[PDB]
Design a protein around this ligand. Structure first.
Ligand code: W0G
Ligand code: W0G
Lengths: 269, 268
């Protein structure tokens, strides 16, 4: 991988592995999400930021401040087949004191066609107190030089799905997968549950028949709270709808505390 | 990746990814196991075998025959750091009518030093009846041309760890992790639980303090039965001792054995 000519974005190619594919012999949405994370981390390393998933500066580390994902939105047109080379371009943009946005474009390396796109909203938070805070000018100035200044949106459209408000699923849920627990492979280098694990947990409550006869086109996921290594989660899904749509909720198995909420849109194969 | 000059082995380089590392900033043993699987699959593709993890020929497919792992043995000296390039060489050897053996050597791409080694025993089985077959003659002839004929062993030493008999853990276990279930990410392209998931499940019953103060040096795992997508598993561990543990994975209901193994850990 490498930063592009103007130094305001980063590109990397990946060859889809045998264990990275599903029953269709194409990469799963979790393989895609891991690759978006990988190219994001390589972009942070290329310009001197921390590489632990928190993209900190020396200034942020002294204050115990980290960047955390508030929302992830992914849209896939074609999942790359096993052995295919997918090229991913990523960039970051500040959104004032709200936080930052990281976008991605996925392309087939052979044809050059856009096979997918993703956008994510990030907020700053104290690592220890978990208290959110707006971005200071001193912190902002450290990353503005690595971002394009004119707007560059992976989702430019007026009424695009990436900014839609997600409602809270009401009990009873139509489907559920109960008692989900993370294992050591689900943790990152900081012993925190990887954001991609939550995508897998959301998808666990989708009936196998939907998975066997449909392809996932869009997934939007809001992150409210993190699941600890010793927490137990319940994944809930209700059909909201040629296309199928679902509303999702991940909540702690005991008290029912919300950890995530989201929507999925599936198209008939 | 590519087959070597003599066409009797296969090599491939891998760059360790950010999500592939543990709390030590080095690749986990599950990342290693996935990479061994990947290079094995690429070797099968390179010479015309099936790429679904069963390494079948047109002859085996007609008979509904597959290759299945009976034992996996991995020894790691140095886990590659994130961003490091690890080079892996793999080859296969027939072991008569018993089955086949696939070996691997892991090396640091920068220094050329051997950082690890693995060996695995495979047996032939009918996919549907799950009944073992003592290989054939026409099936054997199909793969002998892709294997070295003189012995080439990743673990040459007589009476080494890779061939040790593993005993059955007795109740009560000293440690346990109960109610483990596979999710869709744990399945392969055939909707079967990936062999690497069982390695993760074995390690789940090792106390966090062992993991925090030790490095895994050797893992030997016997595979007796497959866990279905709707099965629930209990992982049991007892200290036998460097630290050594005896392991058992059994179905949560009836207690039916799915795997047994041993791990050897070194103080950091
Ligand atoms: C998570 N958002 C952060 C904010 C700074 N940042 C970033 C900006 C430009 C280049 C590389 C970078 F890592 C992020 O990715
Ligand atoms: C599982 N063991 C099988 C038996 C044949 N085989 C093999 C041999 C040489 C080259 C490529 C190969 F796939 C295996 O790996």
């Amino acid at each position: 991988g490498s930063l592009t000519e103007d130094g305001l974005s980063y590109k990397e190619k990946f060859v889809v592995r045998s264990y990275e594919v599903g029953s269709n012999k194409t990469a799963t949405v979790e393989t895609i999400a891991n690759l978006l994370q990988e190219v994001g981390c390589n972009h942070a390393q290329s310009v001197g930021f921390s590489t632990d998933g928190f993209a900190t500066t020396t200034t942020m580390r002294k204050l115990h401040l980290i960047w955390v994902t508030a929302r992830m939105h992914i849209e896939i047109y074609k999942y790359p087949a096993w052995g295919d080379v997918v090229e991913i371009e990523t960039w970051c943009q500040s959104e004032g004191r709200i936080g930052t946005r990281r976008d991605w474009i996925l392309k087939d390396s052979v044809t050059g066609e856009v096979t997918g796109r993703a956008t994510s909203k990030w907020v700053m938070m104290n690592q220890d107190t978990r208290r959110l805070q707006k971005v200071s000018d001193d912190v902002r100035d450290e990353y503005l030089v690595f971002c394009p200044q004119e707007p560059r949106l992976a989702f430019p459209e007026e009424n695009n799905r990436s900014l839609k408000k997600i409602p809270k699923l009401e009990d009873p849920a139509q489907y559920s997968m109960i008692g989900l627990k993370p294992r050591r492979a689900d943790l990152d280098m900081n012993q925190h549950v990887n954001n991609v694990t939550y995508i897998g947990w959301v998808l666990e409550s989708i009936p196998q028949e939907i998975v066997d006869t449909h392809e996932l086109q869009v997934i939007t996921l809001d992150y409210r709270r993190e699941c600890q290594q010793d927490d137990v989660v319940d994944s809930l899904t209700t059909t909201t709808s040629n296309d199928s749509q679902f509303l999702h909720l991940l909540r702690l198995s005991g008290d029912g505390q919300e950890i995530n909420r989201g929507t999925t849109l599936w198209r008939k194969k």
